[PDB]
Symmetry: D2
């Protein structure tokens, strides 16, 4: 256990009294609303979201990076930190690896994971940056690059990612590339998309039978004029063209300003192409901020769609949920903890929606009562459920409070190399 | 002739000398660039864009409407004004009608059209507002309304539009609806879309063998939380679902801030679902401003995709071009004239692009020269080409100046009584 | 009373038991947090927001208007409807009038208001539309129109609004105009602004000593290329130039996409030019939707700034709040009721913020705990406080439920003739 | 001469015949329009825009940086490359330095500058990133940081920039910081701004009386929730508060989506607080693309306000123009060359506007003819005037073509060490 159990038990006992009062109070309120609190907690305890290995290290912008103390040295240091997140929140049992950053002996990776009690989520290929010794540069693209040898190198890399993932227990490959252009005329939109499609097809053929291929759309950055996989429409065309094992990934901060993201989710669900999510929040662009920290209601509405589907028996439906954030000004572990918590919060509130009541108001065109039906669920403070879920599953009532109480950060800082501030770079 | 021929002739003669000089200079410049100006002018004089019947009258906002003098009394007056735009620019031989605003005896509409030298483009249905006598209101939707009878009523209306279009020479029906929600929860996104798809499938059944059905997407307005046909992604699903006769219409001002609109155009083309365009310009939302008055380069970039399709040899590519604007602070006829000119302007510039050179720069990833190749065409002032194209086809060298010299606005002002209630 | 008192009492009693339990529970939770629920309820009871006379009628878009039954026609019907909102919520004791729409004999308006238990907030002028018989059209502008006589007419109109206001108990004139351009070159940005500043100076001269002159900025619509008073920067320049009686009004949905609105509010408070706040919500443009129906956290963050200003006792801080919304597909009365409720909800949550702890986290640069400190307040379901506040002040535990139980809408529908 | 004179003369003679024809044709057309092309050329030849020392090297995003060949090894190499831009375009005689990136013996800097025929524009401070060995980190701010010692350190750095600038002939200091927050509550908006103003007042106190102090606003990035100097409104408050020597700098890509930037320019001019511009283009956020590459008309409209200011008779109006761009997928020298050309292009077109005609249409509310009056100027292809201006002042008829014929990039590539692609960073 990365965090001493006596500290966890101690920090829980310290808050047990208040929790009992709040939980029983909320329990009575829900009962008056015809809702059994135990049924919600039982579901919340089972809700999981994968954490990004690259998320436990401090992030940065193109202007600078200000690392904290005890920055993780490599994937192994990172897994150790992800263990902390899972132990205290019990909501992040799986970690998502990124190659070549997390390149390591598949036997040692699987070894540490099992030891730390962590599983592995979808693999992540990297063809948006160049690595040492690389034969062809991805400066002008990768899977859609005009140079055939460059596309081939990109395809081979993605295939290597699948191999690594097969050796650690992953069951999916997520493909996000920066491919696009910064100038009108630089790229022929159609030709570039045709090339992307052809290369992706080669990756699909190399997909195991129980694997999923997720394509992630993004409006801009690193490309500032056009991006091959710029939105969900193009992403749908990709998934539909490649095959049934290919689905679409929806990263929250990857859409144009004012976009109705929850609608996109419902559409991809309708046509069976919602591969999963990349949770995070933002206000301006692809800010990659802590989930729910900026627009908590938006996060809830997205979950309202997921729960609605989760309700009206969409037999073939189990999207891969993942946190895709960058932490530039906070302890990465604390943010990921609260982000995972915020995600379960929105999930829990969505479960509180009186579906039958909502359907009625929708059918009646009672817009006011329909929206109020959602607000009644969203306004509910489900913190007692989240805390109780963690408590009875081996986690902490107040994850961050316990994290700080353990003094874990100062601990790893004394074990790891000191860091130095520098220029841009995530 | 809405505008006296002697007026046009006189106004053209007045500007003949300057036109000769500019055209010959541009012609020599183009020749040095390996381009035949006559070939460009020949293609430009054949580029047509449909004029909206509803654009000839002054528009407004939810805050107010400030009509001008001589506002069109009805559809026949509107056709009379459209004839002015076509006579002077020769770029708008076809009019787009809207039902029920333009409802009238089809034979009469057809006869006035032929008399004025005007044809008819795609019909436009209207279930975003209530007409008198409707059994059901479209307040909460139309084709996707929760009430079965309301949807049936909307379908029948669209079918009537097809019947009217069949009698006047139209070959398509454009469907833009306001259906959506203003509050989270008000609508079930998926169920509302399912109802719409079923309704559109019924309308699809009433399509003649040679007709097209265009669905127009829009991010917001009148709905301010969610819209059923909110973007091109949903629009593609619609066309793909309905069949080969159904395509998507792209209206420039209907996209989220910063959207790359020309890419959407390219994507729809690649999958054979670009039905047509609704030209206009904007800066904030669906402003419906004169085409190219705000972002002329963007308009060029859209046409660059259109011309590239032809270059790539896309088969059966025949998108329907239409102007969809509202003129709140100018003479509608003058705005539509210059808007039509701007569209031909961007088209001509797109034709000037050295695509052999461009393909080379794209292949080699020479981003700077690639973009400069597009700019060399865009920076070219093709006004002399548009003017000559008008001169040789019976139009005016300077359309707005000729319109003003004719005194048309004052004439119709004295002929048409202004609304009093 | 627009709504029978027996109805209010009956609908309160059937909800009294449940409220008791929730209020007690929340009271206990807050006590464990060092907060006295009673104190919070007391402040919520005193938080008021003006309702716009034009908000009780059904709104519409440039594409269509779909009126509901019992549509109020004229200021008298509207005042009758506004009275319901106030009786049930007790958070909207004042109504904002718009001239010429609400033009009526001052004495009659004042008496009608007093009889309904309603007061009058800021007056609103209208030079973004043409009234019949008007000598000069506002098609190309009003206060900043290139024609001198057109500007004088707009000025005279605003002065008249002040006169009407003085007679009914108003203490401010809000000025929002459509003035702008739809095409580059159509207007000379600087000259148009100079003209606006000069005309506003004339209006300022007619202000009593205790009156305020509010200027409202808007990015676009009706102008689609440029707007004279386009943002808070221009707005501040106006307030500063005009004088101490002139301040800026911030309307939520009048900003560019992604703008940090709460910051603009803080900036204006710091320089003493925050005249008022126009509440509503939006997602795309100036949608004028029900406050907090789309982004409730944003509403709370705006109030966080308002509550902080009070706490630290900022001078010149005394904003005039108003709801500026339009209801196109709901019962206007029900939306205004729930919007007023949401505004009080955000206010209450802001009041729960632990300022001492927050300040500590800000000084130590502990961003995570700082935001969590705001969230602990925001996540608190303060509905029990809002309901008890209403119950204690003659309102309804559940405003909408009581409104519907009363059958008020069917009643006015029977008294008012719809078009068809 | 970085570029051999014989190369310049050869590439000019090669295109001299065509230019003579295009220039004479344009001259006749303008003459018919009552405009003397000579008067336009004369003004264009004197229009200058400073080049950023940091724009000579290849830029990057937080995702990666793909360096080209012959990357400059330091400020001296950068100055050498800037000299190429000036020699070929003749529109960028001045270079804007950035400290500490360009820290070096100011005496030597001045020596190289004079030798290359370059001057120095405004100095640019850097408290948006930590330099090696830095005492206090700017992770949580600089001039507005809650820590007094951190603010003092930032002030001192700015004063240091002033001393360097005084030594090389600079007459201004531009201040752009990343100060802001990534989470609601993290910062107290007003207190942070008060700290900023006090710190800036200190810098202002140390400002020479023949110098100007420019503050640059930006909506977001690096801060993704709030930014202290977020817009022109806050910027005006700053300039007004500090004093007559303090003005506002407008960077095109630093505004919210759909913002009417040309109006901001007019407002600042009317109130005498427009210190200057930072030219570049964008489509999504602060893209930092080649000026006019995305929205050429907007660029013209900005220059329309500038030229109108002169037409209106505004006195003492001499804004400092500077290119603030990053080049991630092109030869930085070629991009700066064409960007400088595009800025002169827009300026030339603005000069063509018939002011008397425009004024009449504005007074009469003839919107259509007013906008058509701007378009008549904008649609005019002024390339001949730009090319002839260059040819007459020692430049190249076709800058980029001459640059490529010279083989300069290949040359410096052989003189400088090879680069390695890696993570993000500007
Ligand atoms: C590191 C990871 O590949 C990255 O976050 C992508 O998934 C996408 O979000 C980039 O904008
Ligand atoms: C009148 C016409 O149906 C309408 O303009 C639609 O085409 C769409 O543009 C609406 O915003
Ligand atoms: C009717 C009222 O004047 C109006 O709402 C203005 O205040 C402004 O919000 C408009 O966008
Ligand atoms: C390096 C230079 O200071 C920088 O570009 C700033 O001016 C600002 O534009 C960044 O967003
Ligand atoms: Mn992602
Ligand atoms: Mn991302
Ligand atoms: Mn349209
Ligand atoms: Mn439209
Ligand atoms: Mn308002
Ligand atoms: Mn408004
Ligand atoms: Mn800048
Ligand atoms: Mn910048």
């Amino acid at each position: 256990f990365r965090i001493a159990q006596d500290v966890v038990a101690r920090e829980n006992d310290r808050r047990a009294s208040a929790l009992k009062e709040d939980y029983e109070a909320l329990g009575a309120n829900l009962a008056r609303r015809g809702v059994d609190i135990e049924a919600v907690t039982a579901k919340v305890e089972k809700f999981f979201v994968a954490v990004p290995s690259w998320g436990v290290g401090t992030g940065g912008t193109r202007f600078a990076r200000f690392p904290g103390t005890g920055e993780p040295r490599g994937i192994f240091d990172k897994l150790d930190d992800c263990a902390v997140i899972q132990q205290l929140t019990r909501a992040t049992p799986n970690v998502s690896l990124h190659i070549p950053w997390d390149k390591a002996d598949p036997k040692e990776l699987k070894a540490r994971g099992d030891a730390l009690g962590l599983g592995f989520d979808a693999m992540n290929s990297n063809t948006f940056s160049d690595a040492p010794g690389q034969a062809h540069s991805y400066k002008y693209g990768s899977l859609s690059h005009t140079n055939a040898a460059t596309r081939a190198q990109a395809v081979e890399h993605n295939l290597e990612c699948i191999e690594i993932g097969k050796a650690i227990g992953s069951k999916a490959l997520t493909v996000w590339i920066g491919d696009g252009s910064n100038f009108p005329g630089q790229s022929n939109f159609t030709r570039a998309f045709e090339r992307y499609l052809s290369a992706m097809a080669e990756i699909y053929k190399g997909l195991p039978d129980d694997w999923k291929l997720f394509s992630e759309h993004k409006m801009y950055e690193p490309a500032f004029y056009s991006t091959v996989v710029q939105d969900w429409g193009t992403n749908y065309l990709i998934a539909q063209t490649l095959g049934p094992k290919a689905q679409c990934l929806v990263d929250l901060g990857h859409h144009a300003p004012n976009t109705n993201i929850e609608m996109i989710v419902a559409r991809l669900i309708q046509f069976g192409k919602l591969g999963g999510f990349h949770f995070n929040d933002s206000k301006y662009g692809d800010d990659d901020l802590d989930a729910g920290a900026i627009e908590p209601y938006r996060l809830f509405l997205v979950f309202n769609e997921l729960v609605d589907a989760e309700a009206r028996g969409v037999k073939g439906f189990h999207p891969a949920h993942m946190i895709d954030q960058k932490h530039n000004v906070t302890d990465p572990i604390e943010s990921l903890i609260n982000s995972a918590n915020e995600i379960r919060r929105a999930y829990a509130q969505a479960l509180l929606v009186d579906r039958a009541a909502l359907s009625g108001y929708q059918e009646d065109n009672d817009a006011l009562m329909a929206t109020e039906t959602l607000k009644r669920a969203y306004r509910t403070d489900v913190e007692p459920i989240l805390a109780e879920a963690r408590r009875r599953t081996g986690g902490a009532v107040d994850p961050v409070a316990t994290y700080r109480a353990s003094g874990y950060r100062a601990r790893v800082a004394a074990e790891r190399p000191a860091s130095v501030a520098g220029g841009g770079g995530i």
